[PDB]
Design a protein around this ligand. Structure first.
Ligand SMILES: *Cc1cc2c(cc1C)nc1c(=O)[nH]c(=O)nc-1n2C[C@H](O)[C@H](O)[C@H](O)COP(=O)(O)OP(=O)(O)OC[C@H]1O[C@@H](n2cnc3c(N)ncnc32)[C@H](O)[C@@H]1O
Ligand SMILES: *[C@@H]1O[C@H](CO)[C@@H](O[C@@H]2O[C@H](CO)[C@@H](O[C@@H]3O[C@H](CO)[C@@H](O)[C@H](O)[C@@H]3O)[C@H](O)[C@H]2NC(C)=O)[C@H](O)[C@H]1NC(C)=O
Ligand SMILES: COc1ccc(C[C@H]2c3cc(O)c(OC)cc3CCN2C)cc1O
Ligand SMILES: *[C@@H]1O[C@H](CO)[C@@H](O)[C@H](O)[C@H]1NC(C)=O
Ligand SMILES: [Mg+2]
Length: 497
């Protein structure tokens, strides 16, 4: 019946479930699974996969699926930390957006229309090919999809200068539960607000984003330097880092990746300056001479080169390859936001725990700059002025280490518990792109839970959105009153008597 409907509407790229591991079905399913944690045979699998190739095909796919009792799952880049783009407890149809990867750059307006299956890498590549003086603010990872990423905000190395990806969206096409094709004018300002950070898989299917392209100099300066030190020095480096990072002028970003193994600690310092190396080095010589950076550490390159470089890619060309796997290890990750400086002992204890688990690592970013100049309700992402750091904890492993899975997860749980007193509280804050089901989830098939969905969902909802939660609920009720777009942590609509 679904097939018949799709055909009647001219949607032809559809593949039904197959038990054949070599089937095209399995191939399409796995192409965009970015967390191996959700690849095994015990995981839920879609009853069919649809690859729409135009806005009409996307609209008609939604309309046809609704005539059945299927749960809709949308996938862009497949980076969901919890696999929420390609898993469901209820029978589901996977709408994979990989064929919707057209990027149209308008150099006369310095804007771009970006189909929602496009990855960050594809977008960055298109921009740098078009111009040496334009860039865009989003995350570091080139295989992340614009569909999920911009829907949830999108933080990166230029956010201290330009905010989130979603903060630079000026129009969008949203396909709603009825298949309506809505631009900013059609959807209204509440829904246009909601989609710019309120989370993917909740409002409808974004077909395309219209973004403002942003000025960058023809040469920027970056560094990527790993310090191999002991815990005393590593602790003093991280403790000073937090102040340097949040306080730097907006034209600078300094972030850190860290890990350890017994007495050996490694800290990778990632630096970005919107300008030339003389100014970059003068600034860090003054503010953070403890890093011991030398002239040869500072590299001048184009903006496009800088984003490929910071992502650990070999070439700018690699930005344009959506299936170049970033890691291929199963992982679990959690995140904290902070409001008060971290005491030295927090870094010391964090490093002690990393030293006991070499499969763990941390990623540290400062806010401030433009992030403090954007109001908390400009878009749904609320963590602006007053927010100091974002702190990510990751544990990752390969197939040969699967037996240790339980141990790895226990380690991560204990790290998060250790950090509790030092980070944001009441509530402990989060970030919707860093979706975390440990916070809880709604079973939309459970009547008693659904009756109390607003209060239950406040647990994660207020962590992700703070006071923006209420306006999000109103927007959800307007655009998807029947809850066609849902997942364990989707914004609840209000139900009528
Ligand atoms: C995997 C990963 C993620 C990541 C990162 C590095 C890696 C290796 N670095 C990030 C960074 O530097 N800054 C940042 O803000 N986030 C970073 N992330 C996390 C990433 O933002 C999120 O995982 C993001 O949501 C992923 O988006 P993607 O599009 O790749 O993922 P998805 O699984 O397919 O979708 C996620 C959710 O959104 C819904 N979705 C997908 N497409 C649409 C459209 N077009 N319309 C509406 N909803 C959509 C999915 O259904 C799912 O709910
Ligand atoms: C449904 O969509 C999928 C995914 O886009 C289609 O598969 C893709 O088809 C294109 C065109 O055949 C393939 O590109 C080709 O690649 C070869 C190298 O193998 C290259 O030499 C050609 O220039 C050509 O571009 C592409 O590989 C393939 N992608 C995947 C992931 O399989 C599929 O054809 C569509 N199905 C239907 C029924 O329309
Ligand atoms: C190259 O610089 C960076 C590298 C990694 C990160 C953290 C990144 C991450 C990196 C991985 O490799 C990975 O798989 C195991 C999982 C995760 C999920 C969290 N995510 C955001 C941030 C960076 O700035
Ligand atoms: C609904 O959810 C509640 C709380 O999670 C659970 O106790 C109960 O068993 C569920 N009810 C049904 C009928 O599944
Ligand atoms: Mg076979």
């Amino acid at each position: 019946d679904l097939l018949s409907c799709l055909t009647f509407n001219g949607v032809r790229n559809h593949t039904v479930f197959s038990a054949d591991s070599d089937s095209d079905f399995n191939r399409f399913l796995h192409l965009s699974i970015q967390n191996p944690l959700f690849q095994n045979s015990l995981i839920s699998k879609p009853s069919a996969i649809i690859l729409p190739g135009s806005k009409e095909e996307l609209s008609n796919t939604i309309r046809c699926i609704r005539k059945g009792s299927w749960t809709i799952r949308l996938r862009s880049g497949g980076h969901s930390y919890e696999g929420l783009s390609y898993t469901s407890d209820t029978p589901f149809i996977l709408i994979d957006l990989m064929n919707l990867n057209r990027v149209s750059i308008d150099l006369e307006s310095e804007t771009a229309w970006v189909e929602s299956g496009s990855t960050l890498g594809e977008l960055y590549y298109a921009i740098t090919e078009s111009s040496s003086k334009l860039g865009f603010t989003a995350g570091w990872a080139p295989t992340v999809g614009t569909g999920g990423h911009i829907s949830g905000g999108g933080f990166g190395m230029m956010s201290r200068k330009y905010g989130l990806a979603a903060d630079n969206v000026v129009d969008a096409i949203l396909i709603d539960a009825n298949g309506a094709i809505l631009d900013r004018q059609a959807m209204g300002e509440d829904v246009f607000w909601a989609i710019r950070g309120g989370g993917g898989g909740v409002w409808g299917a974004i077909y395309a984003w219209k973004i403002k392209l942003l000025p960058v100099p023809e040469k920027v300066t970056v560094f990527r330097v790993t310090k191999n030190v002991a815990i005393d020095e590593a602790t003093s480096l991280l403790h000073k880092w937090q102040f340097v990072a949040e306080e730097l002028e907006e034209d600078f970003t300094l972030s850190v990746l860290g890990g350890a193994d017994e007495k050996q600690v490694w800290l990778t310092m990632l630096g970005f300056h919107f300008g030339l190396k003389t100014v970059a080095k003068s600034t860090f010589d003054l503010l953070f001479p403890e890093l011991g950076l030398v002239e040869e550490d500072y590299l001048e390159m184009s903006w496009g080169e800088s984003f490929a470089y910071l992502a650990g890619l070999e070439t700018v060309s690699q930005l344009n390859n959506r299936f170049l796997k970033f890691d291929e290890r199963a992982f679990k990750t959690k995140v904290d936001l902070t409001k008060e400086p971290l005491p030295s002992k927090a870094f010391y204890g964090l490093l002690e725990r990393l030293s006991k688990e070499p499969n763990g690592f941390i990623a540290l970013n400062g806010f401030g700059g433009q992030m403090s100049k954007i109001s908390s309700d400009f878009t749904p992402f609320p963590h602006r002025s007053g927010t100091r750091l974002m702190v990510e904890y990751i544990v990752a492993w390969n197939q040969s280490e699967q037996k240790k899975k339980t141990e790895f997860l226990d380690w991560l749980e204990k790290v998060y518990e250790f950090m509790k007193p030092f980070v944001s509280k009441n509530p402990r804050l989060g970030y919707v792109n860093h979706i975390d089901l440990d916070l809880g989830g709604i079973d939309w098939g459970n009547k008693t839970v659904v009756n109390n969905a607003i209060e239950i969902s406040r647990s994660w909802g207020e962590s992700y959105f703070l006071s923006n939660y209420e306006r999000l609920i109103r927007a959800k009720t307007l655009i998807d009153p029947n809850n066609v777009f849902n997942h364990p942590q989707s914004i609840p609509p209000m139900a009528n008597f």
